Design a protein around this nucleic acid. Structure first.
Ligand SMILES: [Zn+2]
Ligand SMILES: [Zn+2]
Ligand SMILES: [Zn+2]
Ligand SMILES: [Zn+2]
Length: 1229
RNA sequence: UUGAUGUCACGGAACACGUUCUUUGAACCAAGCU
RNA sequence: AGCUUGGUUCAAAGAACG
């Protein structure tokens, strides 16, 4: 009597499943339950077992069929086959106890009254509705749909992952609230099966109505569908426990966070395990990758060997399997590192019936959404915790572009067109505003990418404005999808008006011009797509012929029918009636930097082959399916520097300098850059370099103030991008500014003043600007006709005032031609170190302080050695490969050059000037290896205990930055900075003003830009036991080691030893260098800011000395090398953002103010000043003091001078050694 | 695994807000031993 | 008392969210 119809619904996109509900909570008052009534249900065994399987109720399929029937009946005027249909009853007002009621209006196709209840006959629509006049057999019964075969799964997480969906405010730009739903991918569970039992009494017209309605229902359970009718993951955890043991067995545990983040960095990197940084030699002993070897213990295997074995486990050879290994392994190491809203409907009564436009055109726009920038789509996994900001991925690990986001962006874009937001709330009858009306005829197909590589991790920090450094707890990372990912776009509009609505045409035209800001993190230039290859064709559903094959083809919704429909679509997009300009304008930036640049990324260097401590940031492009790296300045960093430039200028208001909470603020910074509640109107993109600049490595060593030698464990390097005045690094990007800001006169001035400051070199880009990195030569914003760019036109009053002459030197040194002087002496510091006064922050430009640039002219007196240690094999007479990997070859070096230009690194000049500044102001030994324990054949006390606590480095022990040392910061820690406080002076690279003059003529006469080698004597580390004669408590640290000036380099140039006079021989322990002669002129520029009157004076007095002194620079200082002179050429002071002025006339006041502080500091107890002056005293006239180190024994010195064995018991015995080493130019004879 | 004369949930952008940055001369002569 | 011979440092201190 009843026939069963086989129906299978297949989902074309991920569908949504409501979560399991208890029968108690399945009531009508459950907001979460009723919200999920349109979603698939999860059948779960009752008590405590989430094991079960999903299903779709037949009631949901029935209601979806009813809607299609109304739409089909409206399109046919109710004339199905040959008989009419009434509008239906839709009342059931007997009790109204039925979840739930129909809020939307019912479509009206006829004015006839509904069929009377209990009538002997019913129209086809009433037969479909199930109206009736165990005998209650359904006229048409819809059975539930289940997975084929009724499988069983562990729980809802086995099939789908819960996702959070938010509602973003239109004006604020930030989300009011959110709701979560299970998303079950259609690629794993595409098809459902069910039954529709039809009684034999059902009319053929009702059967035709049911079949047509089934072929019309295109969306069920939140997805586009077509209804038809007729031991495994344990490897990554065993490796994790092995690593934690190996780290534990070797102490460590501080590298786990770097190892967790670096191993996870190998997620894309099955082939990257083979290429790892390795040690400084080729020995293969890395401080991170070779932790567990422990001097060749059989039970010990290094972390490198652990991963190499994992790289070839016979199952991780697949890319996907390997990727989940690193994620699981990295996420496991991370855990060890740490350890050690549902809108509701309203029960409104009988819904009004509306005779909507029976024309009902159908429009399909097919295209590709192409990522012009990196994008970011939400979706934080509640299990994964090694990343703070994750991206939405499919279970296949493909990048997903949800229709929930695309629906929201179209809704947001439609509102901007109309200039009217939509204030309708969730619940009640549908909103009838222009935006909601267009969005109810819109269908957007959910999309995924063919590209499958893992996301990049970007590390973002919040900088403390006052301290100039990273704030406490401001390090966080995010997953970023690459540029160039193309998503297949499917837009489908259905409405009465022919073609797309007028607003929809413009928003699609906005998107076509690369102005689709689809994803989140838009402030940092993430999520700008362009709709490409758009096509469209309208379908007239009212036409019987066109509507008939529409049902037969299932609307061409499935992948089989799309290409057939795609042939009909014509290329392009309809021209909007009244096109409106998009609300965002693109400003093209062009920055030029005449210095090296580094935008740091520690994790990428932990995995890089070069092994450098710091490397520059690189992003990836989705070049098809394989990603390619590219060096770029981070958009997050560029926004941060530009935001800082604006904020430090402005005092809004009365008179904080834009450093407020911004909780309830109407701030120039808040409403240009955005707040936590007020998403900004400026969108910075990544900045990329014009050419392909290959990174270079620069070695850095922190010298000890006491021993003058390298401080242990503080030898480092980094791989910045090379730049210079010969080859500036042209950085080219964009930022997007909204209409309401670019048309605002004050914002153009606020941005223009800041961009002028950046133009004036006031804001270096990236990190390590203290040593001359990322100095901006210029900055052009040549988009944006006039407006902002008009303020980037500085005027410098170039009144030619000569810089004051250097004062004559008071220092008097008497040198005898028959004595021999020790190569170095110690300037004993004053007992008082002025630790006051809690230095000024970097958050403003304080009144009274001075900011500007000091142009200096350094000149060499003795030959100068500044080596390029990147190539210690420079001077080798061919046969290079013969001693490669020998580990004992003679080391050779060339002078530092950047892009084939002789230069002095700012780090070199910075320490050389810093050392003199520290002694002049009696500051602490900024670098001092305190932990070293002296042995006298052993001390019971540390070396740092010898000196006073005042001389101790200031860093040594939110408010920890200024509370780290109770006493505070010494004068040179204020100026040159600490780890916790950023320095106020930046030392640029010094460039050779003229063609070089070399100490030794070059081997090839053709090239005058290279010099010959000079072989130095052996250079050995300093012995503090000589300075501190014994373990006696009386003996203390003598003071700052300084190397006197002398001409022992003349003996070395001839090849003779400085002391014995015997010719030096090549050995595996002495160096060969290229040294400039005397007379080479270098210009370098010192940028400072917020300098006091005296600090700028002491700096000048430290930079330029008195007439008759000199500086010591480079290596071989004890051999008379690297005597240099600095003359301050010009002082330019930043009066304001637009006007700069000269201080060439104000120089003598700075020197006077500086010395007055010296007199106040020490009250004419300045013996260290004169002692330093004697040490700095260059030998004037014809006098040639003989300076050298004693030999071990007198018999080893052909000149007859005694040796260390004789001196050790002679005049330098035990108690005359401290006094004879702290007195400059005292001879040991 | 749902009831049935009423399901706009394609009715809802995981959105907004953060500079991998701060400091550090590639430098350096007297001990080691029974 | 016995004569002469030897390279060192290769990252560190922080920040891992308000
Ligand atoms: Zn009827
Ligand atoms: Zn609305
Ligand atoms: Zn503000
Ligand atoms: Zn200090």
């Amino acid at each position: 009597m009843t026939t069963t119809m086989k129906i299978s619904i297949e989902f074309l996109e991920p569908f949504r499943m409501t979560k399991w509900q208890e029968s108690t909570r399945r009531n009508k008052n459950n907001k979460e339950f009723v919200r999920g009534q349109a979603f698939a249900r999860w059948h779960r065994n009752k008590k405590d077992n989430t094991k079960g399987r999903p299903y779709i109720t037949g009631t949901l399929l029935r209601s979806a069929v009813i809607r299609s029937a109304e739409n089909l009946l409206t399109l046919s005027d109710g004339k199905i086959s040959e008989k009419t249909c009434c509008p239906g009853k839709f009342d059931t007002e007997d009790k109204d106890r039925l979840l739930q009621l129909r809020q939307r209006s019912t479509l009206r196709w006829t004015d006839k009254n509904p069929c009377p209840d209990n009538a002997e006959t019913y129209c086809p629509f009433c037969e479909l509705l199930g109206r009736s006049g165990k005998d209650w057999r359904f006229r048409i019964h819809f059975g539930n749909l289940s997975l084929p075969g009724k499988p069983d799964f562990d729980g809802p997480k086995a099939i789908g992952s819960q996702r959070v969906l938010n509602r973003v405010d239109f004006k604020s730009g930030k989300a009011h609230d959110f709701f979560k739903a299970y998303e079950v991918d259609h690629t794993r569970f595409p098809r459902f099966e069910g039954e529709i039992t039809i009684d034999n009494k059902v009319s053929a017209e009702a059967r035709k109505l049911l079949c047509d309605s089934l072929k019309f229902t295109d969306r069920l359970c939140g997805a586009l569908c077509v209804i038809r009718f007729d031991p495994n993951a344990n490897l990554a955890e065993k490796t994790a426990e092995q690593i934690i043991s190996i780290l534990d067995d070797n102490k460590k545990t501080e590298y786990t966070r770097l190892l967790a983040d670096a191993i996870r960095s190998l997620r894309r990197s099955s082939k990257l395990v083979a290429g790892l940084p390795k040690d400084h030699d080729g020995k293969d002993d890395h401080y991170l990758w070779d932790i567990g070897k422990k001097k060749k213990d059989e039970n010990s295997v290094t972390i490198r060997q652990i991963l190499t074995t994992s790289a070839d486990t016979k199952e991780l050879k697949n890319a996907g399997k390997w990727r989940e290994f690193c994620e699981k392994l990295g996420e496991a190491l991370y855990l060890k590192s740490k350890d050690m809203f549902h809108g509701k409907p309203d029960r409104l009564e009988k819904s009004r019936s509306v005779s909507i436009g029976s024309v009902l055109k159908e429009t399909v726009v097919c295209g590709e959404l192409v990522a012009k920038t990196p994008f970011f789509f939400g979706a934080i996994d509640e299990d994964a915790k090694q990343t703070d900001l994750q991206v939405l991925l499919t279970p296949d690990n493909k990048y997903r572009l949800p229709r929930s986001a695309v629906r929201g962006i179209l809704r947001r874009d439609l509102q901007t067109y109309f200039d009217s937001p939509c204030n309708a709330e969730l619940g009640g009858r549908p909103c009838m505003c222009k935006t909601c009306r267009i969005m109810r005829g819109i269908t957007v197909m959910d999309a995924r990418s063919e590209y499958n590589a893992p996301p990049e991790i970007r590390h973002r920090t919040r900088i403390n404005p006052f301290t100039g450094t990273v704030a406490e707890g401001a390090l966080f990372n995010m997953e970023v999808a690459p540029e160039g990912i193309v998503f297949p776009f499917q837009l489908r509009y259905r409405g009465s008006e022919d073609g797309l609505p007028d607003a929809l045409k413009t928003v699609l035209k906005w998107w076509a011009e690369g102005q689709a800001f689809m994803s989140g993190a838009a402030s940092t230039g993430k999520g700008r797509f362009r709709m490409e290859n758009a096509k469209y064709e309208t379908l007239d559903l009212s036409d019987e012929n066109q509507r008939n094959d529409y049902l037969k083809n299932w609307g061409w919704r499935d992948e089989k029918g799309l290409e057939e429909l795609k042939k009909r679509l014509n290329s392009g997009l309809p021209e909007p009636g009244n096109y409106r300009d998009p609300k965002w304008h693109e400003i093209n930036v062009s920055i030029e930097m005449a210095s090296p640049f580094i935008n740091g990324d520690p994790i990428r260097a932990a995995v890089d082959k070069r092994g450098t401590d710091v490397v520059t940031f690189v992003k990836y492009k989705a070049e098809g399916e394989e990603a390619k790296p590219v060096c770029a300045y981070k958009a997050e960093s560029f926004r941060g520097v530009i935001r800082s430039a604006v904020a430090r200028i402005h005092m809004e208001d009365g008179v904080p300098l834009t450093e407020l909470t911004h909780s309830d603020c109407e701030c120039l910074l808040c409403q240009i850059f955005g707040s936590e509640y007020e998403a900004g109107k400026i969108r910075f993109e990544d900045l990329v370099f014009e050419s392909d600049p290959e990174p270079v490595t620069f070695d850095h060593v922190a010298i000890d103030r006491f021993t003058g030698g390298a401080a242990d464990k503080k030898k480092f390097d980094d791989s910045p991008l090379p730049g210079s005045p010969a080859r500036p690094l042209m950085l080219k990007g964009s930022f997007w500014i909204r209409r309401d800001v670019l048309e605002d006169e004050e914002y153009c001035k606020a941005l223009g003043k800041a961009l002028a400051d950046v133009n004036n070199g006031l804001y270096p880009l990236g990190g390590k600007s203290a040593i001359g990195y990322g100095q901006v030569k210029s900055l052009g914003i040549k988009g944006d006709d006039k407006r902002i760019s008009r303020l980037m036109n500085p005027a410098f009053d170039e009144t030619d005032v000569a810089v004051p002459e250097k004062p004559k030197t008071d220092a008097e040194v008497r040198i005898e031609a028959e004595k021999v002087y020790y190569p170095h002496y110690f300037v004993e510091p004053h007992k008082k170190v002025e630790r006051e006064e809690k230095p000024c922050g970097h958050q403003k430009f304080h009144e009274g302080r001075l900011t500007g640039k000091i142009r200096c002219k350094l000149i060499t007196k003795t030959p100068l050695i500044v080596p390029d240690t990147s190539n210690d094999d420079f001077f080798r007479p061919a046969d290079k490969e013969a001693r490669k990997e020998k580990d004992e070859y003679h080391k050779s070096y060339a002078f530092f050059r950047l892009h084939k230009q002789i230069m002095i690194p700012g780090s070199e000049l910075r320490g050389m000037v810093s050392s003199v500044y520290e002694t002049v102001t009696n500051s602490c030994f900024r670098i001092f290896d305190e932990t070293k324990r002296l042995s006298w054949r052993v001390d019971d006390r540390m070396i740092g205990k010898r000196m006073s606590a005042d001389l101790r480095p200031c860093h040594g022990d939110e408010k920890r930055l200024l509370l780290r040392h109770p006493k505070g910061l010494c004068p040179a820690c204020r100026l040159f900075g600490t780890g916790s406080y950023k320095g106020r002076v930046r030392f640029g690279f010094a460039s050779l003003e003229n063609d070089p003059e070399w100490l030794i003529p070059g081997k090839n006469p053709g090239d005058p830009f290279h010099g010959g080698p000079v072989m130095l004597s052996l250079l050995e580390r300093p012995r503090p036991t000589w300075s501190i004669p014994g373990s006696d408590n009386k003996f203390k640290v003598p003071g700052r080691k300084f190397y006197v000036h002398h001409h022992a380099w003349k003996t070395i140039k001839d090849g003779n030893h400085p002391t014995t006079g015997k010719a030096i021989e090549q050995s595996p322990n002495n160096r060969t260098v290229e040294a400039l002669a005397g007379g080479n002129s270098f210009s370098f520029e010192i940028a400072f800011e917020n300098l006091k009157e005296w600090e700028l004076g002491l700096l000048i007095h430290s930079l330029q000395l008195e007439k008759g002194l000199a500086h010591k620079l480079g290596m071989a200082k004890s051999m008379g090398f690297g005597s240099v002179e600095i003359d301050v050429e010009s002082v330019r002071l930043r009066k304001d953002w637009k006007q700069w002025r000269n201080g060439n006339s104000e120089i003598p006041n700075w020197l006077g103010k500086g010395f007055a502080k010296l007199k106040e500091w020490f009250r004419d107890e300045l013996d260290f000043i004169e002692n330093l002056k004697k040490l700095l005293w260059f030998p004037e006239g014809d006098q040639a003091p003989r300076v050298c180190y004693p030999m071990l024994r007198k018999k080893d010195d052909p000149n007859g001078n005694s040796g260390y064995e004789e001196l050790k018991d002679g005049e330098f015995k035990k108690e005359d050694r401290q006094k004879k080493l702290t007195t400059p130019w005292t001879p040991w004879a």
